Amino acid sequence: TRERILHGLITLYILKELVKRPMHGYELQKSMFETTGQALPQGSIYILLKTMKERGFVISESSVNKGQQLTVYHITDAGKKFLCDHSQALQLARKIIDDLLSTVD
Amino acid sequence: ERILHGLITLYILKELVKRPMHGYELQKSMFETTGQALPGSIYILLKTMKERGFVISESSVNEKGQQLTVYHITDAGKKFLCDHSQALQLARKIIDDLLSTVD
Amino acid sequence: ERILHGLITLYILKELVKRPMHGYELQKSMFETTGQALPGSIYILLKTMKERGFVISESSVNEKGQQLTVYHITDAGKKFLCDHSQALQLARKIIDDLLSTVD
Amino acid sequence: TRERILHGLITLYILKELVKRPMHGYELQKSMFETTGQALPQGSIYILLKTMKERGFVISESSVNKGQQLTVYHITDAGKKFLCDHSQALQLARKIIDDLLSTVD
Numbered sequence: 001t002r003e004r005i006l007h008g009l010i011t012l013y014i015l016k017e018l019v020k021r022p023m024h025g026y027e028l029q030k031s032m033f034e035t036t037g038q039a040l041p042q043g044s045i046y047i048l049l050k051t052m053k054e055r056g057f058v059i060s061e062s063s064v065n066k067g068q069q070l071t072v073y074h075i076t077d078a079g080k081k082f083l084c085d086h087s088q089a090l091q092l093a094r095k096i097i098d099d100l101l102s103t104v105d
Numbered sequence: 106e107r108i109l110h111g112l113i114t115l116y117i118l119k120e121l122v123k124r125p126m127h128g129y130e131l132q133k134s135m136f137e138t139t140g141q142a143l144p145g146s147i148y149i150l151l152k153t154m155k156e157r158g159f160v161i162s163e164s165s166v167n168e169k170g171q172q173l174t175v176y177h178i179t180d181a182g183k184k185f186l187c188d189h190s191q192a193l194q195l196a197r198k199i200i201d202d203l204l205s206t207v208d
Numbered sequence: 209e210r211i212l213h214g215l216i217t218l219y220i221l222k223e224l225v226k227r228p229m230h231g232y233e234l235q236k237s238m239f240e241t242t243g244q245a246l247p248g249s250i251y252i253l254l255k256t257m258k259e260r261g262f263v264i265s266e267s268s269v270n271e272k273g274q275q276l277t278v279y280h281i282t283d284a285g286k287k288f289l290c291d292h293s294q295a296l297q298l299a300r301k302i303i304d305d306l307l308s309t310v311d
Numbered sequence: 312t313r314e315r316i317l318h319g320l321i322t323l324y325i326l327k328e329l330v331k332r333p334m335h336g337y338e339l340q341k342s343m344f345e346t347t348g349q350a351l352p353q354g355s356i357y358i359l360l361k362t363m364k365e366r367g368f369v370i371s372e373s374s375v376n377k378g379q380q381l382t383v384y385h386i387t388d389a390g391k392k393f394l395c396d397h398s399q400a401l402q403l404a405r406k407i408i409d410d411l412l413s414t415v416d
């Protein structure tokens with residue numbers, strides 16, 4: 001998440017998931033894992049979400065249960081626009097990545 | 106109450122088929138459905154269910170570094186729920202009778 | 209099954225409010241209502257109910273000089289049945305949910 | 312039941328009860344008891360019912376449970392006629408009984 005291209009892509013993935021329905025962080029973390037076979041480090045999902053909230057892409061809503069915080073994330077209309085805008089050149093991206101991949105262990 | 110205990114167990118199982126859930130969520134959805142609000146009762150039932158091999162749980166860290174629990178249905182649990190279809194149908198019949206005729 | 213056991217107990221109580229009955233009659237009326245036909249199960253439940261102070265029984269000689277048993281509800285039994293009204297309503301809600309959504 | 316006037320009256324009572332719904336013997340025995348405060352001797356109800364069946368006033372239907380006989384009695388149309396016929400002078404009967412009663416301990 002600490003690399004720009006990846007940070008961008010993960011943002012998009014989140015956004016796309018949230019279009020489906022609002023989600024907890026743990027759900028986003030799990031789906032991503034299941035989709036790609038790769039797990040984000042503990043707590044890292046929430047840092048990205050924080051950023052997205054700051055950016056205006058997501059709104060959070062928190063409950064408290066033992067006095068623990070249960071937060072669900074919601075995509076904004078702006079977040080939907082960003083997703084839309086930034087998903088237009090994904091085919092080209094994939095082609096480029098493939099090429100690059102042929103050069104990397 | 107034995108009747109409600111059984112029914113609530115099944116409701117939880119049905120919820121967990123949908124997707125894994127926190128306790129709090131189960132509690133909330135139930136009240137949505139029931140207008141009914143349960144006394145740590147939920148957690149107690151969940152423990153029993155885990156004892157029975159129907160549910161499993163794992164910890165998940167949250168935004169504040171707090172360890173939250175998420176519950177999952179097992180295959181055993183699924184079958185158990187599935188197995189109770191006819192029992193549910195019968196139960197419905199009895200309740201209808203009761204509600205219509207208790208005098 | 210805990211759910212059905214409770215429900216059948218209540219059904220019996222409701223029947224006995226109507227008038228005292230033989231076991232066989234309870235068995236028959238249930239199948240009418242349930243299309244459901246119980247395994248000496250009826251007698252077993254009735255014994256428990258008597259243990260609980262909900263039902264009493266007496267012997268009655270028949271046409272052949274055979275001693276038949278007739279079951280009666282007590283006041284305790286009546287209250288017990290009455291007391292379960294809200295539990296029944298809730299149960300109905302849960303069942304409806306289950307039946308509509310189990311997937 | 313071993314006295315004519317009483318045997319007649321009890322017959323009528325049975326008939327009247329059966330007009331309500333079919334009944335077991337034990338039910339007839341109980342209702343009578345509750346109504347009058349007086350209990351027929353054991354088994355005696357069934358002897359009277361036998362007679363009524365023979366007379367065409369009642370039809371019986373038996374089940375078996377432990378292999379015991381469970382019988383329900385049903386009034387016939389003839390039984391209903393007899394009831395009707397024989398219940399027309401009951402007021403006069405009551406007046407006479409009252410008078411008689413004034414002479415008996």
Ligand SMILES: [Cl-]
Pocket residue numbers: 075076077078
């Ligand atoms: Cl919005």
Ligand SMILES: [Cl-]
Pocket residue numbers: 065127128129130174
């Ligand atoms: Cl929780």
Ligand SMILES: [Cl-]
Pocket residue numbers: 230231232233277376
């Ligand atoms: Cl019986």
Ligand SMILES: [Cl-]
Pocket residue numbers: 386387388389
């Ligand atoms: Cl007839």
